[PDB]
């Protein structure tokens, strides 16, 4: 009935979210970001071509997992210079089966919470990149186009030793239950 359209909407949201998460957590210098209107609020999006392509490729590979409801979580993992996870924005996604301004509005909520989440988060070390983790089951065809293969996440990235938990937002509609929450280390 709906389904494709949910994934479409969801995938685009995650794109916009990942950019904004990189801007507010200062993973790349603020100078690469330009202001864009998105869900009718001010957001920040990278102008750096290769970064933009990295993000697009990641999410275009996630899309088929979303499209047939195989994504348990999409985690933006922030990593320090030594490639150790300092911070994780976990988007945890369910699409239960079963029984449009409302979706925009509930997505806008997550965007807004990200914008101001600097007010509730311990500011990160210098020298940071990120990666994306996707919790799923056992896309091997968009990996092969793209030249953007995926590989099992290392145990150092999945486990965070004794993490602090900072929820930002929850939505619970009929179509979609999503909780966004951060994990920090001590």
């Amino acid at each position: 009935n709906f389904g494709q359209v949910v994934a479409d909407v969801l995938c685009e949201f995650l794109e916009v979210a990942v950019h904004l998460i990189l801007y507010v957590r200062e993973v790349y210098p603020v100078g690469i970001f330009q202001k864009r209107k998105k869900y009718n609020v001010p957001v920040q999006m990278s102008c750096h071509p290769e970064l933009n392509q990295y993000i697009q490729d990641t999410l275009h590979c996630v899309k088929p997992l979303l499209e047939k409801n195989d994504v348990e979580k999409v985690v933006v993992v922030i990593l320090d210079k030594e490639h150790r996870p300092v911070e994780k924005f976990v988007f945890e996604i369910t699409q239960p089966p079963l029984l449009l301004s409302h979706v925009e509005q509930l997505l806008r909520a997550f965007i807004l919470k990200i914008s101001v989440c600097d007010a509730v988060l311990d500011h990160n070390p210098p020298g940071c990149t990120f990666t994306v983790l996707v919790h799923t089951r056992e896309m091997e065809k968009i990996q092969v186009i793209k030249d953007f293969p995926w590989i099992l996440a290392d145990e150092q990235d999945v486990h965070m030793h004794d993490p602090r938990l900072i929820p930002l937002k929850t939505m619970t509609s009929d179509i979609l239950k999503m909780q966004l929450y951060v994990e920090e280390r001590a």
């Binding site: 790349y28 210098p29 690469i32 750096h48 290769e50 970064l51 990295y54 996707v134 919790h135 590989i151």
Partner: peptide
């Protein structure tokens, strides 16, 4: 069986982007 996966490539480094931003 439940699995976590990641992109094999790393995102652009902060340094590489900084240089892009300079030049």
């Amino acid at each position: 069986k439940k699995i976590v996966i990641m992109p094999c490539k790393c995102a652009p480094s902060r340094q590489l982007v900084q240089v892009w931003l300079q030049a």
